Amino acid sequence: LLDEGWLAEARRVPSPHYDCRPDDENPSLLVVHNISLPPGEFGGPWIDALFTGTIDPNAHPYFAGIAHLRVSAHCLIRRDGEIVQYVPFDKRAWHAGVSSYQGRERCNDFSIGIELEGTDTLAYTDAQYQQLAAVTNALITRYPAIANNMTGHCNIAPERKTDPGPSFDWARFRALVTP
Length: 179
Description:
Blueprint: E1 11-12, E2 18-20, E3 29-35, H1 46-52, H2 61-64, E4 75-77, E5 83-85, E6 91-93, E7 100-101, E8 104-105, E9 111-117, H3 126-142, E10 150-152, H4 153-156, H5 170-176
Helix pairs in contact: 3-5
PDB class: hydrolase
Keywords: hydrolase, peptidoglycan amidase, amidase_2 family, activation mechanism
Assembly: monomeric
């Protein structure tokens, strides 16, 4: 629960993949993503590896093509609910790419990116909903603007991204937020 940009309860995997939010800006937007490495598979160390710039391109055919990436998110929430944090919330994680929200581009600058392990068409787990909510509630306490600004990657990069997809139950998530 927020200690110097770090979720107190999260497993910390500090990533070299971050820089500054221009103008010391407080984030105001929560972007929900999904991810699975390799695609459709859960449980590997590969998301940690990708988001820290250490992935083995030879470990899977799919990895060769993404080894060139320099990306990250603030948090990943695994299928069992485990929260792993890579980037302090005050800092700029590299998760949104080319994007626009309410006419403002470069969404990394002012957003917090949280990844749900999963896919567009498979239900996310009960733990995942409870934990995303706990994190979101923590964030809103620090950054009340986030209550008003919660979106999918597919919403700020339409026709580039589809996550977190139809499988993400906004109703369920909202019911758990700001209680």
